[PDB]
Symmetry: C2
Amino acid sequence: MRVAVVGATGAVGREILKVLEARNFPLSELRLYASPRSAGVRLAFRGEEIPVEPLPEGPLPVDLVLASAGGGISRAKALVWAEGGALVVDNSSAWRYEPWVPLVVPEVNREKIFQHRGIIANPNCTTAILAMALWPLHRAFQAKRVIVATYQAASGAGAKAMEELLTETHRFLHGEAPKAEAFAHPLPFNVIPHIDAFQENGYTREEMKVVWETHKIFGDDTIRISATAVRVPTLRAHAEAVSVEFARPVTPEAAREVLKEAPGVEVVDEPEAKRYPMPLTASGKWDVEVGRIRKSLAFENGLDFFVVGDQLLKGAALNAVQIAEEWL
Amino acid sequence: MRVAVVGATGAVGREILKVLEARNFPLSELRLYASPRSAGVRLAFRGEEIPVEPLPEGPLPVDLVLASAGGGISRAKALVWAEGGALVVDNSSAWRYEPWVPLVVPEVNREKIFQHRGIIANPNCTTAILAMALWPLHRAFQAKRVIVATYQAASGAGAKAMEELLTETHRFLHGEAPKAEAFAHPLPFNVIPHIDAFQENGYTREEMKVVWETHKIFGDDTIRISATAVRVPTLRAHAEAVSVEFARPVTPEAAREVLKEAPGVEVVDEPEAKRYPMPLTASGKWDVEVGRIRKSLAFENGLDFFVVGDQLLKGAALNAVQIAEEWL
């Protein structure tokens, strides 16, 4: 199974090698691709060093293409590739909101993988994990209203921004005013209620995704979803205080056992033992932790939970994993 | 006109006297008090230093008393310092919920002042700054359902909890494991979905205050409230993302015009300009920043916004402002 990795040198692309390694993904070939910028650099796989070819304006030669190199190139290459007979999984937002491409999270609509006709859209970060937990609640209790507050990380802004936070928080401690460059403002010791592009209704493209992606990933345009994407001083883990109004009578004790069964969703819920989800323990694991399950006081039949999932893994883990299923 | 500070050395005692010294307070006596732990220290004030006294088991001698030395101590002397003839204004969770005690935020229930019997409670920092936004919106459209995902800083944990945050990040930035002592878990580069202590309902003592406290200051027992409280790696500014369902058709623009006219509350809401509240650009002001005001997609007639206010000031400031009115 010849596989290409368009985007290699990026945060996702780089994690894409290790999970791809860690799941013992059975390749045959090994192809890393980047735009000219990284035309001559080397990464590492199975301890063995592998080159990074710049992308050639001309489709060849692979079975599977795992794209994590912006929408510029993806919007531009998707078709060209799947035509060469390569299965295309893109982590960018170029084909997501398109009627012919399935937007999949293996815990939910794996069924859609085989409804593809050349490409498959990898979901947003904030959406993937939130689904990993919100998938089973929906199926069991039918939601109708979600209100999330995001505690997003630096990795979401790429690797250069993950680094910025290190160096910046560093100069901060030493007196010198943070040199904001990778974010809209200086992020050390602060929060930016601004993740993406502001639309006409007030929300940002990021916020708006929590909805359009859900409405499709679940195939239910009927769920009322509100969300505030906020950037915070954290390396690679996304946090999101969630709330929901249900059809069926919830029970923090019924959502628990149920949650206690869902795949890839470590339940982490113990107040007495100061035991709840945290980027402290979420970052690194393939799972998403979920805690603070409590009978919501806001809604007449609601729940307030907290969720954490590694942000670079809910890019790459669900990627290299959609393929593992393609196999199925 | 004599005043005393009980907890004259704590982070809050120190903002008190500086907004005392800054709002040119009509005092006439400068008695600073603190527990024996600190029975030998001197603070600043109008140029001269003042010695700090250990809390006397002999309540007296003053007219006004800005207490800020904990809960066990205010519970045991509020009544006494009171019988002496002093007016006790306490910034702690100890009297706030007693029937005969007025919980006051000048801008909302000033009149409640003149209906007290010795003690006037000073609400929860995550309520005061939150009340400055929700009040006008509430007495103009009428709240029915509030949901707030707090982003509280280490300032509210304390002085030793701010100082700790700095050295631990620094330590962390240097490749060594944070050694928490001031927080539940290591705070550097992380979020902690737990603030005070857990109640049986599944909610922490923190959240519930943001409710109970709101009911009493507002005079509306009926208002399905719901809080979520998380400590973020920030110095002394508190952020919250809100979503209040309102009865009267509300307007993002109509509500926005209310606020620019609401006291002690500055509006900051220009998306095209990357203009919204930020701990950074709000820590040290007497106004609370509101912005990101938008028509919420969660409910039919609702509003979502971002709120940022300085914790330590909405400790000291709301306290020496209650007294200013104890004069008027």
